[PDB]
Amino acid sequence: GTRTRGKLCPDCLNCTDLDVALGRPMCVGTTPSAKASILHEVRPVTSGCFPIMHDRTKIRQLPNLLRGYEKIRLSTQNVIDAEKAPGGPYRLGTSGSCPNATSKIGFFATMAWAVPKDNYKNATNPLTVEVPYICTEGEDQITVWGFHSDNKIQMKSLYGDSNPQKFTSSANGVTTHYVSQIGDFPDQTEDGGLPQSGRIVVDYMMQKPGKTGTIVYQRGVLLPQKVWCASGRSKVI
């Protein structure tokens, strides 16, 4: 009678569950719904895009929570205009470490890499941005955020100061802060094999239907563009 799904996206070849979860390029596809989904990975491991400091956050259990939801679909449209966020003009950070069928460049769709234009050189002030609820009638807002941090000189090469950056988000009573890490980054893991002195810290926040999402950030943030709209409950096993 009923059917099952172990792979969150069939027809997404060579893509693990966390590959399609982060919105890795060449892993986006139709993610259908089945009331009885099977759990397979104790350690959801990625493969491809920019290396991740997985242990810094609770990011590893995004699909195992998403698999408990019946219907799943990524955001049809962007959540916020990244370039028009406060704190100066921003350039959509593309990258060659996350390739694409047309060109070797690309990046996550769930998150965009914000880079301040070279007009930026000033003592900064903390910033804030809300996160709307674009999702449908009952589908919960599963927003995926993060920030980038590189070596000491590369941060100063990209941003105004070599000093660490401060971030924090809050939604549905869950409030968490984050400070960036500089230098002596751990080994490259779950990447495409290309050397990168920078690292990525990924996390997510849940907004019940109508609940606004708050995001306070500094330089080096990975603002979300696409987000997950999931509702109901799917049987986990």
């Epitope: 990258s95 060659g96 070797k104 890499w113 880079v115 990209l158 290309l194």
Partner: antibody, heavy 126, light 108 residues
């Protein structure tokens, strides 16, 4: 009028160091990566160094590895090339050129065709 | 490292003639190749970008081709205004390399 004007030409004795400059105008200078290309007068083309729109990814040729260095300022619409310990073979005409792709790549693969070249300035090595 | 080698190096052809220049790469490159025109004493200008895509603002008579290991350049009808030395250029990985260049001169 889209212009690329090289500057800082002349004479340098062997072993010296120079700081070449390039002025951009007529286009959004911040979106396109930049390249430097040399050419011995009446001879072929050799590539010098390329940089993305950002200062994040720098790439040098092995012939000038560790001796030359690229730098740019998009707030002033100017491109620089820092040269150290000039060899005798480095005597050539050097061109300033912009990339055609506007991809803000920040990664290894950002370089493409030029489509816009300056008139170039002569580097003489006593 | 990549290296480009162009075939004729010196081409003599009549007015209105179709000339062909090939540029084979040392290693394999997928469509990542461009072409440039350089008259002596003046700055070069691009003609064909990314294997046979003609640059906007250049005459329609020019054309390219190629994929994988062998790449082809083509001038359909020759005008005296086309005299120059031509170079193929790659934009795949590592330092961009040019061929040793091909010179072109006319024969009428």
């Amino acid at each position: 009028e889209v212009q690329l004007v090289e500057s800082g030409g002349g004479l340098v004795q062997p072993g010296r160091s120079l700081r070449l400059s390039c002025a951009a105008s007529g286009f959004t200078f911040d979106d396109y990566p930049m390249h430097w290309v040399r050419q011995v007068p009446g001879k072929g083309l050799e590539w010098v160094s390329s940089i993305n729109w950002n200062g994040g990814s720098t790439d040098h040729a092995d012939s000038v590895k560790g001796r030359f260095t690229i730098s740019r300022d998009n707030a002033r619409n100017s491109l620089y090339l820092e040269m150290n310990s000039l060899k005798s073979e480095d005597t050539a005409l050097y061109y300033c050129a912009k990339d055609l792709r506007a991809s803000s790549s920040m990664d290894y693969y950002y370089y493409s065709g030029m489509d816009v070249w300056g008139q170039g300035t002569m580097v003489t090595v006593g | 490292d990549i290296q480009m080698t162009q075939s004729p190096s010196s081409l003599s052809a009549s007015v209105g003639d179709r000339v062909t220049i090939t540029c084979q790469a040392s290693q394999g490159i997928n469509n990542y190749l461009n072409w440039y025109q350089q008259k002596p004493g003046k700055a070069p200008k691009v003609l064909i970008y990314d294997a046979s895509n003609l640059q906007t603002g250049v005459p329609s008579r020019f054309s390219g081709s190629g994929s994988g290991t062998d790449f082809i350049f083509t001038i359909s009808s020759l005008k005296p205004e086309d005299v120059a030395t031509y170079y193929c250029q790659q934009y795949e990985n590592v330092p961009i390399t040019f061929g040793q260049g091909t010179r072109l001169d006319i024969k009428r």
